[PDB]
Structure formats: structure tokens, C-alpha cells
Amino acid sequence: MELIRIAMKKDLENDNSLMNKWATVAGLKNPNPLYDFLNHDGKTFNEFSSIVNIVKSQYPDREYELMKDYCLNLDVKTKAARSALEYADANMFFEIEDVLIDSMISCSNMKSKEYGKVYKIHRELSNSVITEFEAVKRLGKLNIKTPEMNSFSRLLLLYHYLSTGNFSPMAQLIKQIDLSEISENMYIRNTYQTRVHVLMSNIKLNENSLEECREYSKKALESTNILRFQVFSYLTIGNSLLFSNYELAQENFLKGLSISVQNENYNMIFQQALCFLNNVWRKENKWINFESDSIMDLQEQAHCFINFNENSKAKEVLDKLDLLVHNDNELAMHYYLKGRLEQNKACFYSSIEYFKKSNDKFLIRLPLLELQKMGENQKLLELLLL
Amino acid sequence: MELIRIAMKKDLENDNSLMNKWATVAGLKNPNPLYDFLNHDGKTFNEFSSIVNIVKSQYPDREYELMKDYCLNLDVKTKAARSALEYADANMFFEIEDVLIDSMISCSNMKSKEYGKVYKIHRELSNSVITEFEAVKRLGKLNIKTPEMNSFSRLLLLYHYLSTGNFSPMAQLIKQIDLSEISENMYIRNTYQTRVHVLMSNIKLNENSLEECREYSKKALESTNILRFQVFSYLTIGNSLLFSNYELAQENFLKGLSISVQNENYNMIFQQALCFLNNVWRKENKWINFESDSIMDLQEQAHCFINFNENSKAKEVLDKLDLLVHNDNELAMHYYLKGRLEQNKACFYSSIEYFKKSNDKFLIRLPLLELQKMGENQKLLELLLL
């Protein structure tokens, strides 16, 4: 018997009216399938939402431990296990996901085998085990039959383009996703619906359509109860505000921090966001990571030192950075910083140039702002955001 | 029984040494399969290049009439008919292509059925019978098995993006094509190789990598004997030169006109190219179409009138145009022209704005040049090109 059923029975003896509270929370028409779930091994709810919502409602603090246990006892050939694969991925529960994938790739059920292989491609692409060219090649060769995996094959690519800064294929790819084709699995349909709204929000951020960006993140938030999509919606909203409204940006980053502080990753993500925000607005910065030697944290150190005319301190950090291999995006920042330190238009021009190479219509504001202050034509600077 | 075999036998009796002349031209090791082709109904060459090259060599002036007849008597289930479908499409022989497609969709051979359906999607997308979203949907649903149709499904989309001005997804899509996977049909492999070189040349034009552009068009020309790919290679080379070298641009357009003047479409394409060139360099313009009411020709009329300070005449043409529904690209031109007529910086800014909306890194030079002349910062104007 799974930890979730043990905990639900122990809590059912102390409080007998939890039966109809859980049946409503699970979205069921009567307590019937919930009864089945408690007294017969392997009886799974028609929709995976049912158990998720119960766990979130009743054991919010224990979600990972309980869901891990439940998921890893699931018959890998059922609809519930397929739902579990999505649930693990959505939540970034990698150890659950990888076990599920591994049994699914070589099982007798054809539908489970397909989800298995598609999610494997996603995992491999995320970790740089394979190139994008090999991923798409392998996806073609699967002859994908379910509309679920048909959507996920696009989403998986969308994630990869987003994290490598390769924005241009995104707008066209997302328009091809059609979730209305997914009819058997409502958990997957809705989770994917959330995935799409956050992805849309991000695309809009990159094209500098800031209101639309926020409109899409709000749709994301209203569509989900998964921490991960909430984290990234708050992050995107905050970013969409980074240059225009300090207070509202800060509020969004702190909101995100507050729901996610428990998790080291999410914590760091909001720490970095707050750090950026505070350097952009030239405030005192309690969020600088003095212990990291990554390029991002060092640039923030520099940016801060420069903001406060701590010029010698800036130079040391800039010296440390000139020894590190920069990509196009990181070089754009480098030139921005150099430009600020030496008050040199040429550096801002190079900054613009590299932001343009890396297709960044966001951070490019930094060198554009400096040029404005130096009296360059505001009309031209605005067109450079286009 | 086909007109091509009748004409080849009649020409073989009057001149007996045509046997080894045609065998070399067909690329065969000896006259053997050529003998078979002439004296047994339905014997088709191993590679479709063989009959094409013969026809081009021997009946250049009658290629369409003869190839039409030959193609439409072909067993729709053979490799030669599949080759014929490519040959008709490459050449824009639409009446041959549509008949071939239509019999191929519902024949017993699996491979022919697949090429049939893919090319149908291409035809329908080219004519706006279906949307891009429906094309890709329908292609997924075909479960494409051959590497030939796997390449064509990308090429077909590439064509659509190119003709609708939707450049951003192109770079990523073309990188996914791998023609080295096509082993069974050398005609299709090589024709596609030409398709890819021209498409590459065009992508490079749009990204303003002008040397590479030309390098790709030259590869195109050296790889083909199809008029269509020659036309578009000369057009692209000329366009890559439109702003930098008048003489060499003109030479390329005139070369293209000379090999293609017989065909109404190609004629008009070079007429428009020459027209643009000559307005850009502010010469007398032999190529203005005073009889057309399309937006493109009217803008060229205006551009010319403006070049020669015929300001009232310009204004009438501009008035006529404001009554027609404009695209983003057409509006960009409109503002450019308006800008030149009233020497008004605001119009050039709007021009830049709409070129930016339509992802045009080419014609955008026009309003940029005016701003230079009006003394705006050259560094900033350069960055506006990317």
C-alpha cells in the first residue's frame, strides 16, 4: 500500500467528513471512485488531476515524497503512468521522470512506448547529450501517432530554442501546436495549456510586446497550480517590468521568491532577478553573489561597483572576466560595462552589435539608455529596439 | 507511341550517329538502355536525367510539348513518374504536375501515393487554398516514410515563408534538410540540391551576407540546366548587388531576361528587377510599367517621378495608392516615398518602423540613406541594418 493511501486512511479515522471534501477537490460527481482508490490496490482515478489536487489540498508540504512514491508504483502501461510522466516533467522531478522514461521505452504498450521515447529525446536535448539536428531527426523517425506527443515534440523544441537564445523559429513553431486535438488525457491537455501560455509570454517578452507578455503570464497563473509554472510566470512578469516600474517588478520577484524559497534553484533564480533589477535602477544591492565566479554574477558585481563609482573594485572584476570565454550575449554585457566605466560611445556601439547578434531585444536597453543620456537621437534609439 | 519516341526514330533514320551523341548526353556507359527505350513500350531509363538531357540537347525548342506528352503517358507507379512530378514542379509546368498529382494520390503504389500527397499540399499552400497551419497538420498526418518527401515537406514550407516575407523560421528549417539521405533517385537528389542552393542564396540575401549569397547562387547555376533555377539565381545575384554595384546588377538582370524573355512571368520578374535597380540609382528608367494598377508598379512610378522632381505627378500617384489596401512592406515603401516627396524625417522613421515589422533588412537601406544625407549619426544608421 502506497504512502498516500496510508496517510489518507490515518487522516480519515481522525475526521470522517474528509470523504466529501476530497471528492469535491478531486472534481468527482460523488465519493464513488475515491472509495475504490482507497480499498483496492492499483485502482487509478480516471483523471490524474484527482490525486494531484487531493495531495496539494491535503498534504501540500509533502507533495514530492508522496507523489514520488505513488508514481513509482504505477503500472507503466496505464493512462495514469503516462499522466505521471508529464507530472514529473512539468514539476522538474527528474528522478521520477527518468525512471518512468526508462521502463516506458521498452514496455509492451504502444502508447506508453511513444511518450517514453519523446520525453527521452526531450531529456537528452536538455542535457546536451544530442544536438537539435539529431533530436528533430529522431522525432521524424518515430512517426508520432498520438496528438499528445505531437504537441510535446514542438514544446520540447520550443524549450531548447528558448534556453539557447535561438528566438527566430519560436513564433512559427508555437502557432502549429493545437491542443484541441488532445481528447483522451485532460491532465496532459491542461498542463500543456499552461506550458503554451508561459512559452507565449516569453516569446512576447523577446519581441518586446510587454502588455501581451503580461497578459499571457496571467493566463498561465490562472490555469495552473504547479509551482514551476508559477515561478516562471512571476519571473517573466517581473522581467517585462524591469526597465519601466521598479516597484511592480520587485513585487513580482518577491512574490515568486516567497512561494519558492524552499527550493535552491528557484531561490537562486529570484536572487539573480532581484540582483539585476537593483543594478538596473542603481539602488544598493543586497542580492549580489560575491561567492560565485560565473559570468552572470561577476557582471552584476561590476555593474554595482560601477554604479557606485567604486572604479578600482570594478576593474578587478572586469580583469577576472577578460580571462573567461564569453558568448555573444555575455560580450554584449561586457561592452556595456566597459562603456559605462570609460564613458566611451564606441563600447556602447559594440554592445548594441552583440545584442543584435544574439537576438536580444531586452537587455539592449542598457546601452541604448546610455546613448540617450549622451544626447543621441531618441528616434533612432527607439528604432533600435525593433 | 509517345511524341518524343516518334521524333527520335524519325531523326535516327536520317542520321545514324545520333546513337552515341545521345548516349553521352544521357550519361550512359554505352548506347544499350537507349536502344531499349526506343524499341519497347514502357521501358524507362534508370535515371530521369537521361531523357531530360536528350530532349534539351536535341529538341530544346519543343521541351514542354514533348515532355508533357511523355510525362502524361508514364505509369504513375514507377520511379520515372515520381521523377516526372519533381521535373514538372521544378519547371513550374503546372498542368503536368496537377495531372500527375491527381492520379498519384489514389494509386496502389505506396511511394507514389506519398509523393502525390506531399506535392498536393505544396500546390494548395502555394495557391492559398489552405493555411500554413493546415499544411503542416496534414503533413504530420501522412506519417512521411521516404527521405525524398522528408526533404520536400521542408522545402514546400521554405517556399511559403519566402513568398509571404516570413523570413525568421527559414534559417532553422533549411539546416534540418539532409539531402545525403536521398540515395534511390539521383534526379530528385540533384534537383533538390539546386532548390537548396537557391533557397540558401536567398536566406543569405535577407541576412545581408552578400558574398555568401552570390556564392550560393553560383553553386545553383553550376548544378542545373533548369530555366527556373537559372532565372532565380540571376535574380538573386542581381539583387545582392542592387545597392553596391549598378553595372554588375544590371548585367545579371539582363542576362536573366535574355534567357527567359519568352515566358510572361519571368519577363515581368526581370522587368521589375531592372525597374527597381534603375530607380535606386536614380537613372532614366526604361522599365516602368505605366499600364499596371498593382501597388509595386505604382510605387516605382512614384519613385521615378520623385527622382526627376516631377512632384505633382508623384503626388497623383501617391494619392491613387492611399486608396489601396497596404501590407506592412508596402507601407514601408509608401512612407519612404512620402518622405522623399516632402523631405520629412518623420516619414523615414515610419518607413524604418514598417520595414522592421515586415522583417526587411534589404529595402530598409532606402530610408536609412536619406537619414544619412540629412546628417543623422552614421554609426546608428549602420546598426539599424543589424
Residue numbers in the entry:
A (entry chain A), B (entry chain B): 1 to 386
Provide text from the study:
Bacillus phages use a communication system, termed “arbitrium,” to coordinate lysis-lysogeny decisions. Arbitrium communication is mediated by the production and secretion of a hexapeptide (AimP) during lytic cycle. Once internalized, AimP reduces the expression of the negative regulator of lysogeny, AimX, by binding to the transcription factor, AimR, promoting lysogeny. We have elucidated the crystal structures of AimR from the Bacillus subtilis SPbeta phage in its apo form, bound to its DNA operator and in complex with AimP.
To establish the molecular basis of this novel mechanism of phage communication we produced crystals of AimR in its apo form that diffracted to 2.7Å and belong to space group P21 with eight monomers in the asymmetric unit. The overall structure of each monomer shows an N-terminal HTH DNA-binding domain (residues 1–59) directly connected (only 2 residues) to a C-terminal regulatory domain (residues 62–386) composed of 18 helices arranged in a two-layered right-handed superhelix. The HTH motif includes 4 helices (helix α1–α4), and the predicted DNA recognition helix α3 is solvent exposed, which is compatible with the active DNA-binding state proposed for the apo protein (Erez et al., 2017). Sequence analysis with TPRpred server (Zimmermann et al., 2018) only predicts the presence of four TPR, but the structure showed that the 18 α helices of C-terminal domain could be organized in 9 TPR-like motifs if helix α4 of the HTH domain was part of the first TPR. These 9 TPR-like motifs (TPR1–9), unlike other members of the RRNPP family, can be further divided in two subdomains, one N-terminal (TPRN-ter; residues 46–281), which would include helix α4 and encompasses six TPR motifs (TPR1–6), and the other C-terminal (TPRC-ter; residues 295–386), including the remaining three TPR motifs (TPR7–9). The eight monomers (A through H) of the asymmetric unit are arranged into four stable dimers characterized by an overall interface area of around 1,250 Å2. Structural comparison showed that each AimR monomer adopts a slightly different conformation, suggesting intrinsic plasticity for this protein. Protein domain motion analysis with Dyndom showed that this flexibility is due to the different relative disposition of two almost rigid portions, the first one including the HTH domain and the TPRN-ter, and the second one corresponding to the TPRC-ter with a bending region (281–285) placed in the TPR connector that would work as structural hinge. Interactions at the two ends of the TPR superhelix mediate AimR dimerization. The constant region of dimerization is nucleated by the interaction of the C-terminal α22 helices in TPR9, generating a helix bundle where also participate helices α20 from TPR8 that form a four-helix bundle. Although these two TPRs are involved in all the AimR apo dimer interactions, the specific contact changes among dimers, indicating that this region works through a slipping interface of contact.
